């Protein structure tokens, strides 16, 4: 029944709103234009912005490093939101406890870069709950190998953002990403796929009603899972390279 | 209109059959095992020597070269099939080249799954069957050349697509708007949109009791890219350890 699928759509939207304080709607208002965010385009802007915004990741040590570490701090925050949001997906909490951990472990990066797109345009990214805008050109300009940390995520955001998904679409797509049966170490795939099948049915009905003239948007969206897993792959490949530049309770909080 | 999409599905299924001599339906009849189509089985170096006589240098290299000559033949069939896709041949010629360059290996591993089960692979048009084990036991670096394709084929094959479903799926793969260097993305995407609509109607009619097959099949495209990626890594190893080992110019140009 449609009524069922719409019920599931609204349920996930309502929970997405409660879990994620900076929404796409909010992020779009801010990026296009009353209270312009503080812009970091250069080093002397950044050094002013630390003294203007009360950044939560700063401690008592070169700039590129401190910016990268700040991205880690936010990702750990975003893991807790996505965790909480996942518990609202019907059937999720009833899975085997290890598979809940396994799906979250392998799902959070995909969802991070998806939701990052909501805060991005060709020109930069909203930081610190949209209090800041860091320009793509000052990110691009950092020392090797941090210089093009974000460049992949920008290219992926620009192409994602062409689909014009809104928050009520992303709520369901994020749910589909968490419930992937192809994650390694899953003990009981069947119920995971049963819930993902229902999430895809809802995602299909939501795209058809919310975007009635965007042909095959469902298919184009699923195609973007490919660009997600590729961004993620080559992100770990930039990490494993950090462990050959980056020359202890902190280390633990992040891993 | 479903009538236009059914027409396009039949068009594509008819070209597929004209273009690929060894279909999935034929490959399955050989594997499940009729008197008239029993293949010769290579499971060790003894049986390899014997088979090299009944079917028609070190073994690892001879096999790898064989897979290469077989990709080169497959590129020719995929090229012929591509020309049959309404609109392909009307695109900018540079984009035709770029769509074949990136699509061909994703199609080769899709269609190689048709010839595979969890024990081995059909070779020489189904006259031979070479066991997963035998291919695993090859000296490094060729030992693990075939495993990732086997792993992908096991999982692809559980969708139980027949040739009519595959003919549309490989059309979707060729008409991919996101290939690097594409001059004119939008005309490819309008072809792909229509192919996607055709695949979606095909899967619901041919597999009515297989929930969200369409979305399961489109996620497989991530598994294909990974096969291609691992393989290029494996080739750059081979080119250093095996300096006496020829590479077919046509695949060298595809790998550039
Ligand atoms: C005397 C040669 N001989 C006996 C020893 C054989 C041996 C085997 C095969 C064979 N096999 C085993 C299937 C393996 O399938 C593959 C594997 C990989 C590719 C991709 C290629 S490899 C590369 O570097 N670049 C590519 O694009 C394509 C197909 C089929 C066949 O038709 O003939 C055969 C002959």
Residue numbers in the entry:
A (entry chain B): 207 to 239, 243 to 269, 275 to 461, 467 to 474
B (entry chain A): 207 to 239, 241 to 263, 275 to 474
Copy text verbatim from the article accompanying this structure deposition.
Peroxisome proliferator-activated receptors (PPARs) belong to the nuclear receptor superfamily and are categorized into three subtypes—PPARα, β/δ, and γ. PPARγ is an important target molecule for the inflammatory disease and metabolic syndrome. PPARγ agonists were developed as antidiabetic drugs, such as rosiglitazone and pioglitazone but cause adverse effects, such as heart failure, edema, and increased risk of myocardial infarction. The ligand binding cavity of PPARγ is versatile, allowing the design of a large number of unique compounds.
We, thus, designed compound 2, which contained a 7-diethylamino (7-Et2N) coumarin unit. The coumarin-substituted electron-donating groups at position 7 showed strong fluorescence and thus we expected the designed probe 2 to be sufficiently fluorescent to be useful for PPARγ binding assays. We attempted to crystallize human PPARγ-LBD complexed with 2 or 6 to identify the binding mode of PPARγ-LBD. Crystals were grown in the presence of each ligand but 6 provided only the apo structure of PPARγ. The complex with 2 provided the co-crystal structure; the crystallographic analysis data are summarized in Table S1. The overall crystal structure of the 2/PPARγ-LBD complex was similar to that of the rosiglitazone/PPARγ-LBD complex. The TZD moiety formed hydrogen bonds with His323, Tyr473, Ser289, and Gln286, which was identical to that of rosiglitazone in PPARγ-LBD. Compounds 1 and 2 had activities comparable to rosiglitazone, showing that the incorporation of coumarin did not reduce ligand agonistic activity, regardless of if it was 7-MeO coumarin or 7-Et2N coumarin. The fluorescence maxima shifted to shorter wavelength and the fluorescence intensity increased upon increasing the concentration of PPARγ-LBD. We calculated Kd using the fluorescence intensity at 410 nm (2: Kd = 1558 ± 93.61 nM), (6: Kd = 4082 ± 712.2 nM). The determined Ki values therefore showed an identical relationship with the reported EC50 values, suggesting that 2 and 6, PPARγ ligands that incorporate 7-Et2N coumarin, were useful probes for competitive binding assays of PPARγ ligands.
